Paper text:
Here we report that histones are major chromatin components in the bacteria [name] and Leptospira interrogans.
In addition, the α3 helix in [name] forms only one helical turn and the remaining amino acids pack against α2 of the dimerization partner in an extended configuration. This organization differs from the three-turn α3 helix in archaeal/eukaryotic histones, which takes part in tetramerization by contributing to the four-helix bundle interface. Finally, the surface opposite the basic ridge of the [name] dimer is more acidic than that of HMf/HTk histones.
Author numbering:
A (entry chain A), B (entry chain A): 2 to 64
The structure:
């Protein structure tokens, strides 16, 4: 339900830049990661009293 | 170049579940996060001598 990454372009990146295939579960993990980053972004934006999720609401520095 | 998240479905999630709009830069951050997670997955898979990026190669526990 609701794949949130562009599967074809992820597979293309991983193949072209890394010489690797991409498992189905890899796509699932990436999609779930996007969902969590979005929900956490909602939490951050609302806590600031805003109505728009902004780049500063997507905390990805631990990457 | 190469947006790696499904922009329409991200905006739909953020609006429907959080009542928020989604800025253009939010989409950019999410896309760059996916790119980094994929490249790091390539590093992990190759270090294990494999030819396929697997779910265990996408380290997202810091979420």
């Amino acid at each position: 339900a609701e794949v949130l990454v562009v599967t074809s372009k992820v597979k293309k990146l991983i193949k072209e830049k890394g010489q690797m295939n991409t498992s189905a579960e890899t796509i699932d993990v990436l999609s779930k990661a996007i969902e969590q980053l979005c929900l956490k972004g909602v939490e951050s934006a609302k806590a600031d009293g805003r109505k728009t999720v902004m780049a500063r609401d997507i905390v990805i520095d631990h990457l």
